[PDB]
């Protein structure tokens with residue numbers, strides 16, 4: 001079965017965050033240094049909620065500037081409805 005052969009070792013697709021991103025995930029309660037991409041997105045959401053980086057009046061807006069997360073994103077702000085900076089950052093900071 002060639003489909004099985006292809007998918008062996010790549011059915012979970014674990015990643016290792018680079019050290020600055022790993023520090024953010026730990027701050028959100030993550031343990032260890034290997035995650036699924038879904039786990040990474042969970043801990044990033046949780047980080048923004050516990051650091052109170054979102055706008056109470058406009059909850060889709062994150063004000064990450066002068067936080068480590070804003071350094072990693074290269075942004076002062078982003079809307080979750082326009083998440084291009086997050087895609088760019090995870091492309092750069094998640095190692096298979």
Ligand SMILES: COc1ccc(C2=N[C@@H](c3ccc(Cl)cc3)[C@@H](c3ccc(Cl)cc3)N2C(=O)N2CCNC(=O)C2)c(OC(C)C)c1
Nearest residue numbers: 041042044045046048049054059060061062080083086087
């Ligand atoms: C209307 O208010 C919303 C609507 C959606 C989100 C959101 N949307 C989810 C989401 C957004 C973009 C992508 Cl690419 C993936 C997931 C996910 C999330 C995950 C990682 C990051 Cl860095 C930011 C947000 N994510 C969340 O983390 N949410 C889900 C809903 N409410 C929450 O308390 C947490 C949201 O996130 C805050 C953390 C800003 C606020």
